[PDB]
Amino acid sequence: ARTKQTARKSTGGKAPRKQPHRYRPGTVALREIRRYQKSTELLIRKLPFQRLVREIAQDFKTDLRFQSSAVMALQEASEAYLVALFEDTNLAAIHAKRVTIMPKDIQLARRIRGER
Amino acid sequence: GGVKKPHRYRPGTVALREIRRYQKSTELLIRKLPFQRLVREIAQDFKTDLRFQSSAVMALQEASEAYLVALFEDTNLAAIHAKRVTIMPKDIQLARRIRGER
Amino acid sequence: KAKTRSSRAGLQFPVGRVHRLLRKGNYAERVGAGAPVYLAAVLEYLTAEILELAGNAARDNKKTRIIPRHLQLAVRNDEELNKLLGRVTIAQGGVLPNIQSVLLPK
Amino acid sequence: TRKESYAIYVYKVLKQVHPDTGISSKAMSIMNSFVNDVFERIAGEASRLAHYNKRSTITSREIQTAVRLLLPGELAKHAVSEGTKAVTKYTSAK
Amino acid sequence: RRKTRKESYAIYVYKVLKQVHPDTGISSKAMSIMNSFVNDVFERIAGEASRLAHYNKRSTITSREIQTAVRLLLPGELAKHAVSEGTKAVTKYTSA
Amino acid sequence: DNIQGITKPAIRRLARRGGVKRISGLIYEETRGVLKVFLENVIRDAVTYTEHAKRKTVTAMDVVYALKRQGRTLYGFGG
Amino acid sequence: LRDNIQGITKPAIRRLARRGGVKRISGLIYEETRGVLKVFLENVIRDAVTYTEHAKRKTVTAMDVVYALKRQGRTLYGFG
Amino acid sequence: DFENEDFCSACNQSGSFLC
Ligand SMILES: [Zn+2]
């Protein structure tokens, strides 16, 4: 008889203890294709991005301060890398008679790009 | 009554057989003299009477077959991408539309 | 009696040569004594891992010598040497034998 | 007329590894061009590093920051380790 | 302790921006883009010149070997529309 | 988890700038891993460069310097 | 000479693609490929006649070819 | 094989289960 424990608590009562107009799907999407293509501002909210860099650089060297311009350089570079990769993916999709990027479409692009 | 029928490997068996044959060969494929000439007319356009060594040609080939077998390879992955075993001119094109030569 | 710098460093690649080259290469104005020693040390290593892997490849094909082909196997089989020698096209290498799963018969 | 190349040196290190195995001449040239190319990449990166840090000399340090910036992944660690023990034996033997 | 001199071609990029679009200015960001541009393309063309020289077992960057590399890098029309201006400029220099 | 900070709508915004009209749902979490491994390449080299200057802080100059090594130059931040 | 691109025969373009692991080569590929061979061989050979002239040599050397391939990124080992 | 659930099928609450 297989058994498993899920309460994960040796005792109960742990708390009591001492310790309308609507557009068709895609029209708004193309409108803000135009919006984010005519625009130049930076699309990954900064703070969250900076943090991504702190928790990931931590591995290579502790106590590594980053000049502000640097995390802005990492953002720009990351958004440029991903917009280039996403142009390629859309192509890797429009190739297969489709209009929806899918994970496979990007595991391939990166193989032809040779980034893998 | 019983009429003969020649032994013909089904479409694809001869294919994969020569695939295993050719992926063990290192020998160049495009023939030398035909290739050599490919250049003398691809160079005459850049400089006249440019002689060529019998090693520049061999190099400019090894480098070509190598470039082409790479592109075909990404062409195939691109052909499998649309769930098809036939490669198409678009594939050589998607591939090259992603290496950034196009 | 003059000894060589390689036997001082315990190496087979030439440390002397890799100094001249470093100097005439004008990689930088001044080159120190230990820089060619370290470079010869790294070059022999990379020349060794690649030669070992080539030796593992050859015996397999039961060939005494090491033909250029083996050098491709060694490089493409390994996932490190392949990032290094990754935009490099060796002479007479062929390609790593590989066919896709969808191309196999059912 | 004299052509400088790493023929006998790579042959030696080959016997050090395998003292029973031959080598092809074309394959040799593969080895010679390969060690020349990786030498160029490690030395160039080093030159750069230096020129960025406003230094002027290629210390064994640069070649390292370099080997660890070019050689990928593990190939590096084992390169460093061997380069550090090599320069350690160079300074020990003076 | 006045800050040391930072090299930049900014002052220059402007003269040229005035010799093309007179009543147009540039933003700091775009200027710095242009400085990174000229430093990058100069490093590219100067590195090529270097090898060209080394390959030919000679040791001197001259005008020939740079007309050659700018050609080998700058692509297409850009190249021709450069080499011509470059030879003019060299002859006008040597003129006096 | 700081990785989950790269939010969906943000990946959607990157796709929109990239001209994608319908994003699969499984893309969002693929784009994180790809993002991470890439940043994890630049920032690695960014720091090798950093610990070569014996600097403990990293600079944007070192960042564009690591990009130059990788291959993808970045204009607008120095150098 | 002229139009020797046809020398890279279909039997061969295939053998290369066969080498590359493809099983069904659609027609309309044999023409596309030869075009790709003639943009590659162009650039390389161009960057080789430029190297050739710089050295004021006439004989396009294999040495130049290798240096040319490097510029474009496709380095070749086996010649120098 | 299939993994059971983390909740009781009778009372829809967590705890030690017989699978
Ligand atoms: Zn219950």
XYZ file of C-alpha atoms and ligand atoms in Angstrom:
693
model
C 0.000 0.000 0.000
C 1.629 3.181 -1.247
C 1.295 6.139 1.094
C 2.308 9.788 0.881
C 2.316 12.744 3.264
C 0.948 16.093 2.159
C 0.014 18.049 5.252
C 3.761 18.184 5.831
C 2.919 19.017 9.433
C 3.629 16.748 12.401
C 0.896 18.551 14.325
C -2.287 20.405 13.422
C -3.255 23.979 14.214
C 0.235 25.278 13.535
C -1.070 28.841 13.507
C -2.290 28.557 17.112
C 1.228 27.906 18.421
C 3.880 29.851 20.341
C 6.443 29.529 17.552
C -19.893 47.187 -26.199
C -17.518 47.805 -29.088
C -14.881 45.088 -29.339
C -12.233 44.680 -32.024
C -11.593 41.358 -33.675
C -8.637 39.405 -32.349
C -5.557 40.780 -34.103
C -6.579 44.334 -35.071
C -5.462 45.750 -31.716
C -2.440 43.454 -32.042
C -1.439 45.037 -35.376
C -2.175 48.512 -33.993
C 0.358 47.995 -31.236
C 2.720 46.314 -33.670
C 2.715 49.790 -35.191
C 2.949 51.386 -31.740
C 5.948 49.359 -30.555
C 7.625 49.605 -33.958
C 7.416 53.399 -34.306
C 8.593 53.691 -30.722
C 12.121 53.469 -29.322
C 11.659 53.271 -25.545
C 12.714 50.278 -23.545
C 10.149 47.541 -23.133
C 11.329 45.421 -20.264
C 10.569 47.388 -17.148
C 14.020 48.441 -15.860
C 14.080 47.471 -12.211
C 12.957 44.008 -12.949
C 15.720 43.787 -15.542
C 18.397 45.150 -13.267
C 17.499 42.544 -10.739
C 17.760 39.847 -13.335
C 21.324 40.913 -13.697
C 22.114 41.060 -10.032
C 20.876 37.517 -9.273
C 22.571 36.167 -12.401
C 25.911 37.958 -12.055
C 26.150 36.921 -8.494
C 27.362 33.623 -9.756
C 30.403 34.937 -11.590
C 31.499 37.329 -8.829
C 29.970 38.476 -5.585
C 29.649 42.058 -4.598
C 29.736 43.307 -8.135
C 28.285 46.727 -8.399
C 27.065 47.781 -11.799
C 27.382 51.239 -13.236
C 23.918 52.483 -14.046
C 24.782 52.841 -17.673
C 25.722 49.216 -17.596
C 22.389 47.770 -16.635
C 21.050 50.108 -19.306
C 23.574 48.605 -21.692
C 22.411 45.095 -20.730
C 18.846 46.120 -21.344
C 19.469 47.631 -24.730
C 21.554 44.663 -25.784
C 18.969 42.176 -24.507
C 16.043 43.918 -26.201
C 18.013 44.142 -29.462
C 18.901 40.435 -29.244
C 15.307 39.409 -28.578
C 13.751 41.650 -31.233
C 16.178 40.213 -33.802
C 15.423 36.679 -32.597
C 11.694 37.413 -32.750
C 11.831 38.741 -36.258
C 13.511 35.472 -37.191
C 10.953 33.421 -35.361
C 8.047 35.115 -37.071
C 9.758 34.118 -40.282
C 10.338 30.608 -39.089
C 6.658 30.556 -38.528
C 5.361 32.327 -41.563
C 7.391 29.596 -43.272
C 5.139 26.789 -42.027
C 1.842 28.297 -43.318
C 1.165 29.814 -39.920
C 0.894 32.996 -37.887
C 1.755 31.987 -34.324
C 5.249 31.801 -33.008
C 5.784 28.644 -31.061
C 8.603 27.343 -28.977
C 9.771 25.032 -31.752
C 9.968 27.963 -34.087
C 12.670 29.416 -31.907
C 14.621 26.312 -31.099
C 15.053 26.123 -34.882
C 15.873 29.707 -35.610
C 18.658 29.544 -33.141
C 19.989 26.399 -34.834
C 20.185 28.035 -38.231
C 21.546 31.222 -36.656
C 24.099 28.855 -35.303
C 23.618 30.115 -31.789
C 23.384 26.557 -30.554
C 1.072 -16.754 -65.704
C 3.705 -15.413 -63.340
C 5.317 -12.413 -65.021
C 8.633 -11.053 -63.777
C 9.216 -7.862 -61.859
C 12.669 -6.317 -61.466
C 14.141 -5.759 -58.036
C 13.810 -2.044 -57.402
C 14.532 -0.548 -54.003
C 11.653 1.586 -52.834
C 11.958 5.356 -53.189
C 14.139 6.345 -50.236
C 16.091 3.152 -49.592
C 18.624 3.972 -52.312
C 18.493 7.524 -50.945
C 19.437 6.666 -47.351
C 21.940 4.084 -48.592
C 23.916 6.687 -50.521
C 23.458 9.078 -47.575
C 25.364 6.620 -45.376
C 27.779 6.155 -48.283
C 28.482 9.881 -48.683
C 28.568 10.852 -44.996
C 31.543 8.507 -44.652
C 33.328 9.892 -47.674
C 35.590 12.893 -47.216
C 36.369 13.076 -50.902
C 35.209 16.221 -52.635
C 31.985 15.991 -54.566
C 31.853 18.750 -57.154
C 34.386 17.582 -59.720
C 37.684 19.477 -59.918
C 37.980 20.603 -63.534
C 34.360 21.647 -63.700
C 34.936 23.685 -60.539
C 38.232 25.150 -61.581
C 36.501 26.636 -64.559
C 33.750 27.938 -62.367
C 36.323 30.309 -60.974
C 38.240 31.406 -64.074
C 35.018 32.923 -65.179
C 34.124 34.107 -61.719
C 37.472 35.814 -61.458
C 37.938 37.129 -64.944
C 35.357 39.613 -63.808
C 37.524 40.915 -60.981
C 40.951 40.850 -62.581
C 42.158 39.760 -65.958
C 44.428 36.837 -66.586
C 44.673 36.032 -62.907
C 46.475 32.791 -62.817
C 45.516 30.441 -60.040
C 47.474 27.806 -58.178
C 46.378 24.207 -58.173
C 45.935 24.721 -54.474
C 43.873 27.863 -54.470
C 41.313 26.043 -56.485
C 41.387 23.072 -54.194
C 40.988 25.403 -51.263
C 38.287 27.526 -52.778
C 36.443 24.276 -53.255
C 36.920 22.656 -49.937
C 35.611 25.904 -48.640
C 32.692 25.785 -50.984
C 31.579 22.217 -50.471
C 31.901 22.939 -46.746
C 29.725 26.060 -47.041
C 27.127 24.224 -49.133
C 26.904 21.132 -46.926
C 26.291 23.415 -44.018
C 23.540 25.316 -45.815
C 21.884 22.186 -47.046
C 21.921 20.980 -43.478
C 19.997 23.990 -42.218
C 17.841 23.694 -45.260
C 16.835 20.257 -44.193
C 15.983 21.284 -40.651
C 13.967 24.040 -42.360
C 12.257 21.439 -44.554
C 11.429 19.272 -41.518
C 10.136 22.473 -39.860
C 7.120 22.495 -42.198
C 6.712 18.716 -41.565
C 8.051 17.930 -45.054
C 10.883 15.751 -46.393
C 11.198 17.705 -49.660
C 13.461 20.740 -49.495
C 12.298 23.837 -51.371
C 13.925 27.055 -52.636
C 12.241 28.899 -49.748
C 14.177 26.798 -47.308
C 17.562 27.662 -48.661
C 16.057 31.108 -48.399
C 14.731 30.997 -44.835
C 17.992 29.559 -43.813
C 19.917 32.291 -45.458
C 17.440 34.894 -44.256
C 18.619 34.060 -40.798
C 22.355 33.775 -41.203
C 22.267 37.451 -42.332
C 23.665 37.255 -45.794
C 20.234 38.150 -47.051
C 76.141 24.783 -21.900
C 72.893 26.577 -22.763
C 69.542 25.059 -21.907
C 66.265 25.910 -23.578
C 63.394 27.775 -21.953
C 60.987 24.901 -22.644
C 62.953 22.495 -20.453
C 62.946 25.243 -17.826
C 59.157 25.315 -18.184
C 58.719 21.617 -18.865
C 56.981 21.814 -22.219
C 57.363 20.501 -25.755
C 56.050 23.438 -27.738
C 58.664 26.125 -28.173
C 58.549 28.939 -25.681
C 61.241 30.804 -27.439
C 59.455 30.884 -30.719
C 56.260 31.942 -29.127
C 58.090 34.957 -27.761
C 59.496 36.136 -30.981
C 56.171 35.743 -32.628
C 54.545 37.624 -29.760
C 57.088 40.377 -30.172
C 57.021 40.723 -33.935
C 53.271 40.369 -33.809
C 53.270 43.736 -32.139
C 50.356 42.540 -30.107
C 51.682 45.016 -27.606
C 54.740 47.192 -26.991
C 56.480 45.163 -24.335
C 56.163 41.485 -23.677
C 57.185 39.857 -20.408
C 59.094 36.643 -19.873
C 56.217 34.542 -18.537
C 53.722 35.363 -21.293
C 55.304 33.095 -23.978
C 55.714 30.365 -21.336
C 52.002 30.449 -20.505
C 51.007 30.595 -24.146
C 53.158 27.643 -25.061
C 51.594 25.887 -22.059
C 48.043 26.495 -23.306
C 48.821 25.723 -26.954
C 50.330 22.338 -26.126
C 47.279 21.514 -24.054
C 44.868 22.391 -26.791
C 47.100 20.543 -29.214
C 47.024 17.603 -26.916
C 43.352 17.263 -26.065
C 42.721 17.495 -29.817
C 45.430 14.910 -30.546
C 44.166 12.579 -27.905
C 40.642 12.729 -29.158
C 42.043 12.127 -32.655
C 43.893 9.093 -31.301
C 40.666 7.766 -29.798
C 39.001 8.293 -33.183
C 41.709 6.629 -35.289
C 42.237 3.363 -33.553
C 38.520 2.964 -34.025
C 38.854 3.134 -37.798
C 41.846 0.814 -37.373
C 44.258 3.149 -39.168
C 47.821 3.615 -37.961
C 48.305 7.235 -38.992
C 46.006 10.149 -38.341
C 44.360 11.348 -41.531
C 42.700 14.746 -41.617
C 39.330 13.027 -41.250
C 39.931 11.908 -37.736
C 40.610 15.493 -36.781
C 37.031 16.407 -37.705
C 35.485 13.641 -35.732
C 37.476 14.626 -32.675
C 36.379 18.235 -33.150
C 32.749 17.724 -33.956
C 32.155 14.960 -31.470
C 33.481 17.121 -28.621
C 31.237 19.963 -27.593
C 34.003 22.216 -26.469
C 36.511 21.915 -29.208
C 33.491 22.527 -31.439
C 32.692 25.921 -30.008
C 36.345 26.804 -30.372
C 36.836 25.359 -33.794
C 33.260 26.258 -34.596
C 33.527 28.567 -37.527
C 36.458 26.583 -38.761
C 36.253 24.158 -41.652
C 38.861 21.492 -41.551
C 40.280 20.038 -44.721
C 38.929 16.628 -45.827
C 36.731 16.268 -42.763
C 33.402 15.242 -44.053
C 30.665 15.814 -41.584
C 29.599 14.036 -38.490
C 27.411 11.209 -39.689
C 23.817 12.113 -38.835
C 20.320 11.618 -40.250
C 17.097 13.083 -38.787
C 14.535 10.894 -37.006
C 11.663 11.801 -39.345
C 13.773 10.665 -42.308
C 14.021 7.148 -40.872
C 11.598 4.533 -42.237
C 8.617 3.708 -40.045
C 63.525 29.138 -47.904
C 63.441 28.154 -44.239
C 59.848 27.581 -43.243
C 58.995 27.968 -39.606
C 56.266 25.689 -38.342
C 55.365 23.545 -35.321
C 56.175 20.188 -36.942
C 58.559 18.481 -34.529
C 56.942 20.076 -31.463
C 53.452 18.716 -32.113
C 55.010 15.440 -33.108
C 56.783 15.301 -29.759
C 53.692 16.064 -27.749
C 51.930 13.400 -29.833
C 54.408 10.773 -28.835
C 54.163 12.090 -25.243
C 50.456 11.276 -25.572
C 50.672 8.309 -27.975
C 54.186 6.975 -28.670
C 52.829 4.626 -31.338
C 50.724 6.766 -33.702
C 51.644 8.297 -37.050
C 50.448 11.572 -38.537
C 49.470 12.737 -42.015
C 51.253 15.747 -43.482
C 48.010 17.425 -44.504
C 46.656 16.624 -41.085
C 49.848 18.118 -39.754
C 49.168 21.314 -41.605
C 45.700 21.189 -40.029
C 47.440 21.108 -36.630
C 49.907 23.874 -37.549
C 47.246 26.249 -38.887
C 45.047 25.406 -35.895
C 47.683 26.230 -33.280
C 48.577 29.374 -35.251
C 44.927 30.473 -35.303
C 44.290 29.853 -31.605
C 47.599 31.596 -30.854
C 46.399 34.595 -32.859
C 43.100 34.714 -31.032
C 44.579 34.386 -27.540
C 47.324 36.932 -28.284
C 44.962 39.418 -29.913
C 42.454 39.354 -27.120
C 45.340 39.871 -24.776
C 46.589 42.824 -26.733
C 43.119 44.249 -26.535
C 42.658 43.695 -22.839
C 45.872 45.520 -22.282
C 44.954 48.416 -24.487
C 41.700 48.704 -22.576
C 43.354 48.681 -19.196
C 45.819 51.300 -20.378
C 48.677 48.895 -19.794
C 51.493 48.281 -22.204
C 52.773 44.799 -21.560
C 51.494 41.309 -22.147
C 51.758 39.741 -18.765
C 51.010 36.111 -18.166
C 47.910 37.526 -16.570
C 46.487 38.835 -19.773
C 47.018 35.563 -21.554
C 44.845 34.113 -18.820
C 42.011 36.595 -18.737
C 42.195 35.862 -22.405
C 42.275 32.069 -22.370
C 39.279 32.286 -20.074
C 37.562 34.699 -22.388
C 38.178 32.759 -25.589
C 38.549 29.042 -24.898
C 35.072 27.953 -23.994
C 33.875 26.244 -20.885
C 36.039 23.582 -19.365
C 38.640 23.717 -22.067
C 39.592 26.830 -20.190
C 39.971 25.553 -16.706
C 42.322 22.867 -17.875
C 44.186 25.415 -19.939
C 44.621 27.785 -17.091
C 45.637 25.049 -14.668
C 48.314 23.832 -17.080
C 49.495 27.359 -17.895
C 49.762 28.273 -14.218
C 51.722 25.123 -13.376
C 53.899 25.743 -16.446
C 54.776 29.295 -15.403
C 55.229 28.009 -11.842
C 57.827 25.585 -13.114
C 59.369 28.344 -15.229
C 59.824 30.597 -12.188
C 60.925 27.668 -10.008
C 63.612 26.751 -12.540
C 64.221 30.513 -13.083
C 42.128 67.570 -10.259
C 40.422 68.532 -13.516
C 39.207 65.459 -15.376
C 41.711 64.163 -17.913
C 41.056 64.676 -21.607
C 38.644 62.115 -23.129
C 39.263 61.558 -26.775
C 36.299 62.245 -29.029
C 35.558 63.238 -32.526
C 32.432 64.942 -31.448
C 33.699 68.364 -32.342
C 34.463 67.040 -35.747
C 31.217 65.181 -36.322
C 29.544 68.538 -35.977
C 31.538 70.450 -38.520
C 30.513 67.716 -40.952
C 26.919 67.821 -39.740
C 27.044 71.483 -40.630
C 28.533 70.830 -44.045
C 25.581 68.642 -44.903
C 22.450 69.675 -43.052
C 23.330 73.200 -42.010
C 20.373 73.961 -39.754
C 20.406 70.622 -37.982
C 21.778 69.656 -34.615
C 22.489 66.372 -32.979
C 21.587 65.039 -29.586
C 24.173 63.901 -27.158
C 23.049 60.341 -27.523
C 23.287 60.429 -31.302
C 26.664 62.125 -31.151
C 28.010 59.462 -28.895
C 26.555 56.929 -31.352
C 28.575 58.665 -34.062
C 31.761 58.632 -31.971
C 31.335 54.906 -31.318
C 30.743 54.537 -35.066
C 33.926 56.307 -36.129
C 35.997 54.521 -33.477
C 34.593 51.131 -34.524
C 34.991 51.580 -38.271
C 38.441 53.121 -37.765
C 39.482 50.130 -35.661
C 38.111 47.775 -38.330
C 39.905 49.471 -41.220
C 43.112 49.998 -39.228
C 43.185 46.371 -38.126
C 42.753 45.244 -41.661
C 45.513 47.500 -42.785
C 47.728 45.860 -40.240
C 47.344 42.337 -41.464
C 47.502 43.291 -45.069
C 50.932 44.512 -44.241
C 51.995 41.614 -42.151
C 50.796 39.141 -44.744
C 52.942 40.673 -47.372
C 55.852 40.388 -45.013
C 56.318 44.143 -45.067
C 56.102 46.510 -42.133
C 54.530 49.868 -42.894
C 50.975 51.028 -43.205
C 50.863 53.240 -46.337
C 48.155 54.628 -48.607
C 48.065 51.670 -50.920
C 47.362 49.061 -48.302
C 44.575 51.098 -46.883
C 42.887 51.796 -50.169
C 42.974 47.998 -50.268
C 41.446 47.306 -46.861
C 38.803 49.994 -46.943
C 37.795 48.212 -50.119
C 37.906 44.872 -48.381
C 35.611 46.127 -45.640
C 33.382 48.985 -46.699
C 31.062 47.248 -49.104
C 29.976 48.209 -52.571
C 29.447 51.738 -53.603
C 30.557 52.916 -50.233
C 33.993 51.635 -51.087
C 34.338 53.313 -54.411
C 32.795 56.499 -53.144
C 35.473 56.465 -50.517
C 38.590 55.417 -52.273
C 38.021 58.263 -54.750
C 37.670 60.887 -52.007
C 40.588 59.367 -50.216
C 42.958 59.597 -53.173
C 41.845 63.144 -53.791
C 42.454 64.032 -50.229
C 45.894 62.393 -50.287
C 46.876 64.225 -53.485
C 45.636 67.508 -52.102
C 47.711 66.852 -49.030
C 50.815 65.988 -50.974
C 50.068 68.905 -53.256
C 51.279 71.239 -50.573
C 12.443 34.060 -9.557
C 14.017 37.331 -10.559
C 13.749 35.622 -13.884
C 10.045 35.364 -13.553
C 10.321 39.152 -13.265
C 10.619 39.215 -17.057
C 6.880 39.201 -17.311
C 4.585 37.898 -19.982
C 3.293 41.195 -21.193
C 6.948 42.249 -21.485
C 7.742 39.239 -23.677
C 4.582 40.110 -25.610
C 5.916 43.658 -26.058
C 9.195 42.240 -27.368
C 7.223 40.076 -29.807
C 5.181 43.025 -30.919
C 8.296 45.042 -31.602
C 9.450 41.853 -33.341
C 6.341 41.786 -35.528
C 4.704 38.672 -34.058
C 0.900 38.593 -34.120
C 0.113 35.515 -32.076
C 2.405 34.272 -29.387
C 2.089 30.734 -28.219
C 1.777 30.457 -24.511
C 4.700 28.175 -24.197
C 6.949 30.748 -25.806
C 6.979 33.023 -22.823
C 8.858 30.494 -20.723
C 11.259 29.600 -23.508
C 12.203 33.153 -23.950
C 13.196 33.346 -20.381
C 15.733 30.530 -20.536
C 17.163 31.823 -23.829
C 17.352 35.313 -22.325
C 19.100 34.056 -19.238
C 21.684 31.966 -21.007
C 22.531 34.936 -23.265
C 22.786 37.488 -20.486
C 24.722 34.763 -18.703
C 27.214 34.960 -21.491
C 27.708 38.669 -21.754
C 27.728 39.304 -18.035
C 30.223 36.514 -17.675
C 32.624 38.161 -20.024
C 31.688 41.509 -18.631
C 33.040 40.365 -15.377
C 36.153 38.618 -16.675
C 37.032 42.002 -18.064
C 36.079 43.510 -14.691
C 38.312 41.321 -12.631
C 41.093 42.105 -15.009
C 40.994 45.708 -14.123
C 40.932 44.707 -10.529
C 37.835 46.799 -10.535
C 35.071 45.470 -8.376
C 32.438 47.472 -10.005
C 31.437 46.741 -13.517
C 31.124 49.477 -16.136
C 28.946 49.961 -19.200
C 32.244 50.210 -21.052
C 33.027 46.635 -19.981
C 29.518 45.623 -21.083
C 29.903 46.915 -24.646
C 33.415 45.449 -24.518
C 31.988 41.986 -23.782
C 29.488 42.511 -26.604
C 32.296 43.336 -28.972
C 33.891 40.062 -28.019
C 30.674 38.067 -28.505
C 30.280 39.783 -31.816
C 27.303 42.054 -31.410
C 28.723 45.542 -31.068
C 26.601 48.146 -29.281
C 26.897 51.780 -30.223
C 25.683 54.472 -27.878
C 27.303 53.641 -24.600
C 30.974 54.404 -25.079
C 33.988 53.046 -26.898
C 35.163 31.230 -69.803
C 31.366 31.517 -69.779
C 28.405 29.901 -67.988
C 30.438 27.140 -66.450
C 28.190 27.229 -63.416
C 26.423 24.394 -65.121
C 29.528 22.387 -64.382
C 28.371 21.968 -60.846
C 26.077 19.342 -62.228
C 22.818 18.365 -60.648
C 24.235 14.960 -60.021
C 26.706 16.787 -57.850
C 24.629 19.465 -56.238
C 22.729 16.455 -55.050
C 25.744 14.587 -53.839
C 26.506 17.638 -51.722
C 22.975 17.896 -50.439
C 23.037 14.169 -49.984
C 26.134 14.777 -48.035
C 24.181 17.322 -46.013
C 21.618 14.755 -45.043
C 18.681 15.570 -47.286
C 16.624 12.840 -48.898
C 14.341 14.611 -51.308
C 15.763 17.428 -53.358
C 13.019 19.299 -55.047
C 13.874 20.597 -58.430
C 14.053 24.364 -58.322
C 16.811 23.788 -55.801
C 19.493 22.941 -58.293
C 19.174 26.431 -59.682
C 18.927 28.132 -56.324
C 22.001 26.409 -55.044
C 24.160 27.220 -57.995
C 23.177 30.803 -57.263
C 24.338 30.473 -53.722
C 27.613 28.965 -54.879
C 28.031 32.019 -57.088
C 27.590 34.578 -54.373
C 29.899 32.782 -52.054
C 32.554 32.052 -54.599
C 32.151 35.615 -55.654
C 32.904 37.288 -52.397
C 35.717 34.922 -51.546
C 37.354 35.235 -54.950
C 36.856 38.988 -54.930
C 38.540 39.330 -51.577
C 41.210 37.185 -53.066
C 41.831 39.187 -56.188
C 42.060 42.276 -53.971
C 44.645 40.491 -51.832
C 46.278 39.316 -55.071
C 46.681 42.783 -56.483
C 47.849 44.238 -53.206
C 50.777 41.914 -53.317
C 51.207 42.959 -56.873
C 51.196 39.297 -57.616
C 49.306 37.888 -60.506
C 48.990 34.263 -59.528
C 46.024 34.099 -57.274
C 47.583 32.157 -54.408
C 45.901 29.597 -52.148
C 47.389 31.681 -49.347
C 45.177 34.566 -50.338
C 42.161 32.329 -50.531
C 42.558 31.308 -46.950
C 42.954 34.874 -45.754
C 39.870 35.788 -47.702
C 37.794 33.100 -46.186
C 38.879 34.316 -42.795
C 37.632 37.799 -43.393
C 34.182 36.478 -44.101
C 34.408 34.167 -41.129
C 34.725 30.830 -42.802
C 38.288 29.975 -41.808
C 39.880 26.992 -43.531
C 42.556 24.776 -42.067
C 44.829 22.687 -44.214
C 46.632 25.163 -46.411
C 48.422 27.714 -44.187
C 2.507 5.054 -13.460
C 0.594 8.173 -12.383
C 1.232 10.507 -9.455
C -1.638 10.839 -6.999
C -3.066 13.833 -5.841
C -1.997 16.174 -3.051
C -5.552 16.424 -1.666
C -7.948 13.880 -0.208
C -10.607 12.693 -2.628
C -13.237 12.586 0.144
C -12.849 15.846 2.091
C -10.705 17.882 -0.380
C -8.108 18.631 2.300
C -4.398 17.972 2.672
C -2.889 15.404 5.000
C -1.450 11.911 5.064
C -3.124 9.840 2.358
C -3.564 6.217 1.378
C -2.865 6.169 -2.354
Zn -10.036 13.169 3.770
